[PDB]
């Protein structure tokens, strides 16, 4: 037998309860980061390694910009939820 | 700046909404598995590799036993939530 909930992986752009930022001219922070990491390492790194680097990129390279002081200089950290039972590589 | 919610990792014994199994004589499935993998690889595998193996061990090696057919032959799958921004090794 195998748990029916096994082998799922959820990569959320943000942690539970928080906002998720998006640049109207460049796209959301999470996707910009996810795409740059995948373009350079999509075929040589394990999925968790990729998403961990996405987490760091979003956490360090982005910071909100707004007129309203209430939403000025805000940060973001993605959230990875894994129920995987093996390592995942996109190759061979 | 760094997001205040960054660098946390939660290793849950089961997925949201489900029960978690424990043996009165051997201990909980998740802990049994976690210690087993850590005794063998805690010093040479990255944290996600360890928990992924833990996920597989709990998913494959355990099945519940109870007189009541309602709780008989049930399975379990752990849940890893990561906000880590780097790979984690416990040595060197």
């Amino acid at each position: 037998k195998i748990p029916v909930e096994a082998d799922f992986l959820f990569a959320y752009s943000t942690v539970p309860g928080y906002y998720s930022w998006r640049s109207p001219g460049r796209g959301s922070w999470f996707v910009q980061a996810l795409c740059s990491i995948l373009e350079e390492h999509g075929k040589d790194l394990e999925i968790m390694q990729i998403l961990t680097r996405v987490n760091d990129r979003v956490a360090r390279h982005f910071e909100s910009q707004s007129d309203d002081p209430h939403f000025h200089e805000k940060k973001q950290i993605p959230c990875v939820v894994s129920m995987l039972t093996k390592e995942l590589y996109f190759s061979q | 700046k760094i997001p205040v919610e960054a660098d946390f990792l939660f290793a849950y014994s089961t997925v949201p909404g489900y029960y978690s199994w424990r043996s009165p004589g051997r201990g909980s499935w998740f802990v049994q598995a976690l210690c087993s993998i850590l005794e063998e690889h805690g010093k040479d595998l990255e944290i996600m590799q360890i928990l992924t193996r833990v996920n597989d061990r709990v998913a494959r090696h355990f099945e519940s036993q109870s007189d009541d057919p309602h709780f008989h032959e049930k399975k379990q799958i752990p849940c890893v939530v990561s906000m880590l921004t780097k790979e984690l090794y416990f040595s060197q």
């Binding site: 040589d44 394990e46 | 040479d44 060197q92």
Partner: peptide, 5 residues
């Protein structure tokens, strides 16, 4: 593949 510490 090769995850090496």
């Amino acid at each position: 593949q090769g995850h090496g510490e």
